[model samples]
Target: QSACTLQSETHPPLTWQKCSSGGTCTQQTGSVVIDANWRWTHATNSSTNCYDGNTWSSTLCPDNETCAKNCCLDGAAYASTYGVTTSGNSLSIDFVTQSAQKNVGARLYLMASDTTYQEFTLLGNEFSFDVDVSQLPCGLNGALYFVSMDADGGVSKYPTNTAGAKYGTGYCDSQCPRDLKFINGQANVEGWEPSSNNANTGIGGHGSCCSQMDIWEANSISEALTPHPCTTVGQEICEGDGCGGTYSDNRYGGTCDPDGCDWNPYRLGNTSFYGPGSSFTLDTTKKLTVVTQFETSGAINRYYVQNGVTFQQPNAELGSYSGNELNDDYCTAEEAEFGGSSFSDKGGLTQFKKATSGGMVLVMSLWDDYYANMLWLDSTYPTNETSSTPGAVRGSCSTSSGVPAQVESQSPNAKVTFSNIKFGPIGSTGNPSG
Candidate 1:
């Protein structure tokens, strides 16, 4: 971006303007230039693209290549090897082991970037994905959920864009200031993934040392306190996992030791998660449907229902809150410098995770874990995963059963199908409410 320094003075609101740095900058004493204004231009420009550098959302993308509003996946750009397409109001992603995809035998079949759409905004409160996971093969990791962001594009600890946030306010695709972290949404089926093994398992409860997916929410990301170093995997800073992490970035703050997960390796910030497995079951014998109501705003409540048959889902429960360790995400001094902007934190902004500010977009993905213990429910997490691109190990959840375990035979062919997408206010899903 362009950071101008109005060198004559220094203050809080506007520190620098009309400034340029780094060798890539260009300025001339005789030239007075004016760039494009960005009041209503959030969509038309972010440079959203596929893995191969093709424009995934230049003007928009191929049907299956893009999610509802404007979110796009990076799967199709990689040789269109597997089956990634959208037809008749439905989107499908077919991942493969040796579809030889990213092509090293190379783990997954699709590599989608983070996407943002202006239309399907999270304002409605409730969200649901009428999907059918009948044919979905459990490969590494896969599931659909909602997230808030700063700018636009891919977001997460494992970003496809290793090039850094130079695009906009997003941590992955762009570096613009509109980025926000995940607020609330249900994972529906499998994949509360990579959390500390839960220690409980009653009817719909989870157990420790096992892999179980859960409802989740977090601030941007950050390193640990001094002397500690954010090296605890998911809890602290990953040093290099692709999120916007640094000492200065403020859209996401660092937790010295937050209560949600004190020693856990979840991203640095206040995070609320409810999963111990058994709590929610992804029954393979039935068509799973998850419906989440933006009940209040920053809070998300979900309900699970099976095809009108035997066991639907157990009673739904609570997810996340906005009061905890959710530090600053507005005009932070660090984020200002990170984006080369001239604004500073002046107490004129509001905190994130607000029930009144529902704006998370929907996202679903499948990829191998880049870090160990991320999805190793059945095997030992190797310390040498830096070069392994092997993907998440499967629990061998049978076509005949859907329970969590160390089932390795379930590898290489994991898949899920989601259909009949519907979203609206709290009662839109038509299922009973808690």
Candidate 2:
């Protein structure tokens, strides 16, 4: 699709730091843009909506090529339309926003310039940020992750795509999400199906595939750090059962590992480690600093800071696993303890290295699940599975807690704030050892 001049795109400026050993740091300036999926896609030179709600217009989008030629992706009014706001070093997104139309959630990417995304090489560095998830409730996720998406949002490769990274175009994940409005420089309208539960979302014929490293996926009640590797390193399109993940009938039949090797404190038998009150070691009721390090030795480590106190990640105390970091050993143990092999099938850490070694784009989002109600993140998953199962009980939230419509209404004012982002050599930012 083409870029529209109707609403001039303007990325919100943000400031972060690139640090060195001994606390030396350099401030860097960047900006953020909302995903193209959230923009107003319409007929070129007209007000006709090419894509409305959860369906493409039959008139303008009768076919893929025709739709690609007819559609124009308009720029956004970030704060008013998408509930996104950035102030200096901080970025905040609200759960539900109301302006010209009601908006539910948002996904944003950091940009190196007006036409390219900022990429991060994390193998031997540490990334740190301060977050306040006090208003986030069950069923909601405020995530910070990395994906192997094209630096220019596939513009160079997909010639028909003129919108580029300025519009946050390319987005691929381990889930191979089929909800993308456009794929391969064309509208994904061929086999579109409007959602039964969500009025503003639906599934399309093609799914965007890639490797994903979820450095943080959390809310107030629970948190998870996961790595989803894929046989293929970068963006690829898939269909039918080959798509796999939440969009496909067979969850593990795709090129990417949908259910990642995860380390959720609660699921790993450290229920008292993170929560909303003082009773927990790392209380969620207040702002906290989070630090994650990727070592050259292939280990991923994490720690936190709150109220001037630094806290190390709690070791997994499950029956047969005991580790506080993510490594090949921990991933192996997790797959063995759980009853899945998709991680290994998708190449495990070896694939993850191949993916991230090329550097990855940073993505931050706030969303509520429509398929599983996010129970997989903060409640008992596979609701029919007994609680006695090792991976069944993930958190204290009830299985019924994350219904989209329910959370949308109950927590309309919910918001998440991420601030003071810093990246550098190990122990440079928020590291207790520093």
Candidate 3:
């Protein structure tokens, strides 16, 4: 029978080492079974010859041996081994493993810089290590293996006594060697082919239905890294009224045509502008002179008026009168006066709320008619007045002879004035109307 033995440079003794890290060692005298799950079927077969420095040979034992040849197991097969040649640095190693056939199982071990072997429990069929090479011989690399354990706690070398084993006869030819590929100290088998079946069964292939995998590194463990801000042109700003109303319409005052208001009706001089909440009150009794000029083709006329304690209209209601009047024919020109016994002592613009003060806001409107006399004459005189002048005269005389002669009253000019304003605390005394 072909005899195969496995020896480690350091360990818990070969006889005591089992598939389990701490289990007692045992021995097997016959053929050993190996798992043939999907992952194990794809690994590098032991039948492929390899070179261990001096000679090229197979990992399988000679045919003369009665014991069955060693093969790759399902849970514990071939795992990757790596070590850094530099000092004070870490190296990562990744590899595969499988559960044994027959009664034996797979075993894995890791060696550090001190040449001490640490038996790792074969949990799910895979293993990894981040070894610090600085403590070991400079420029030295670590080693790894796929080993089997017997019931007597003894470890078997890969490629057992069976010549045509699963990883050999089932895959490659009869010659299988130990070392074929050397991975880096930081080897990553995450995307490697031929994974452990029992451990990787549910995991789907890359881009497959269940094949999502990702790894990321951060400066600290607390949170993920911050994302970069967008740099594209016209990038949107993330605040109310973005960039404080730059680049867009101002919505204020200026001479910029679309956004300008130089000819706006509520502006006086360069400093005074009118809108909601824009007004100043006259605190003391004072005289106010108002002059308005009407431009006419035939003649230019001016009207002047004066008043005591004038109260300018508050901003809340100014727009009601500034523009557009009477179906666009003419604009009304009038000022309002607050009257009644309740407002007698008030002397300036006042805001009234129920319970605190009692008064009413009054509005007056005056309009100009260019043809006032013509309009009245057309309605009062018949077309036949010239044919019967005497009759027309009699009609007028009778209308004038009443106890109070009918006065000829006409609407005033386009302007009207208000006087005797009062606004103050309740119960104060002053003229209510003027």
TM-score per candidate, in order?
0.39, 0.97, 0.14
- Going through the candidates in the order shown, the clash numbers are 63, 0, 39
Query: Which candidate, 1 or 2, has the higher TM-score?
Result: 2
Q: Indicate whether candidate 2 or candidate 3 has the larger lDDT.
A: 2
Better of 1 and 3 by TM-score: 1
Candidate 3 segments exceeding 4 Å error: 1-54, 57-132, 135-159, 162-434
- TM-score-wise, the better of 2 and 3 is 2
Q: What shift in Å separates residue 5 of candidate 2 from its native position after superposition?
A: 1.8
Model 2, 39-150: lDDT tens per residue?
9998888989998888899999998788989998999998888899999999999999999788998999999998999989888888999999899999999999999999
Of candidate 2, the 10-residue stretch with the lowest lDDT total is 425-434
How accurate locally is residue 158 in candidate 1, as Cα lDDT from 0 to 100? 26
In model 1, the runs with Cα more than 4 Å from the true position are 1-79, 97-116, 119-124, 134-139, 150-282, 309-352, 355-358, 376-410, 431-434
User: Which whole-number lDDT from 0 to 100 does residue 216 have in model 3?
Assistant: 8
